[PDB]
Design a protein around this ligand. Sequence first.
Ligand SMILES: [Zn+2]
Ligand SMILES: [Zn+2]
Length: 70
Amino acid sequence: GSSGSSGCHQCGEFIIGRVIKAMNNSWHPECFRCDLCQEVLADIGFVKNAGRHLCRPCHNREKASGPSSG
Ligand SMILES: [Zn+2]
Ligand SMILES: [Zn+2]
């Protein structure tokens, strides 16, 4: 049949206690980290970009539109 209801995608292990819902999936409070700084995006939150989980800080630095804008 099936094993577990909500398991982490990062590592895979089953989450017990705190389940971080993101990218339409369950993850751990330590697994779900940024893709540029690997910062826990459980409480601080995350930002979906280019199919990657980033933190306001980074995401902002990346998305940051060039300084030269006509
Ligand atoms: Zn995990
Ligand atoms: Zn980051």
